[PDB]
Symmetry: D2
Subunit: 94 residues, 4 copies
């Protein structure tokens, strides 16, 4: 299954603007679906940068969006594919 | 229409191994088709590296393969898309 | 000697914001120096992205700045390198 | 201080060829020094890919080597930086 890493650009501070990132990487998988979730809900208009190499069928995806973390709010990265029996959800931990 | 640049990795020398590259870049175009041609014929098993950014709908594609240029042989890059009325062919010039 | 390409991000339109780029690539960066010029003067607000690989000692540099092209202004890229007898100045061909 | 991640390209299998990676990232590279170690000894056949951006002074370094993991051998990455009181050694957790 693809490697999934979830992290903020700068050290996380409540009420301070930051970037949420989900880095998805691996081999032998096309048409991967990636979403960022806020309190279980899909965040719309998330940007992404995609890199792939045919030589080893590798892919490296970065999904990111500007955000301001708080105590009440929980974030995660949701990855889906045909290879997966169910969407793989990875919670963000500061 | 996408920018297309065709070039060898090292200075071209007849009968000397090298890499043929076609660099295709632009904005607002998905599912672009790229082929390298030898004497008008599609070269099979060409590798490629693909990079794209959603922020500006940009793409940067590098199609490459190992080759040995000669006097008799002519090479080109063929790019196609729905946006194009006909495949755009760009001949390699040493 | 290093390869030098000077180009705008989008087709130039006088009076409209754009980015001017100088892409410098080659092997053995050594004492490489790159600057963008306006009417012969160094542009202050220039940033750069640098990529290098020790395997083949290749380097790929992108020097860039936001700019507003006009009919009267001349832009160029100045490059100095050990392999050059004197600094090379490549004019932006609109 | 710089972020340091040590990992193999594919899941480790004893006796099977793989790549060991040390990914070092942060802001203001300055006098950064990176090495891969086997049983405390510097590995000679290490290459690296370096990416940096002047906009935010970010840097992203990938130091890598082909290796054949075994049960007995210990690998690590050594990093020295101005922001570190002494060089940091991060062991590869298989």
């Amino acid at each position: 299954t693809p490697k999934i890493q979830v992290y903020s650009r700068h050290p996380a501070e409540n009420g301070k603007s930051n970037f949420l990132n989900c880095y998805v990487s691996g081999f032998h998988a096309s048409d991967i679906e990636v979403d960022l979730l806020k309190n279980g809900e899909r965040i719309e208009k998330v940007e992404h940068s995609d890199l792939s190499f045919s030589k080893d069928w590798s892919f490296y995806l970065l999904y990111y969006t500007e955000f301001t973390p708080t105590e009440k709010d929980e974030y995660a990265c949701r990855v889906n594919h045909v290879t997966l029996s169910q969407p793989k959800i990875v919670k963000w931990d500061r």
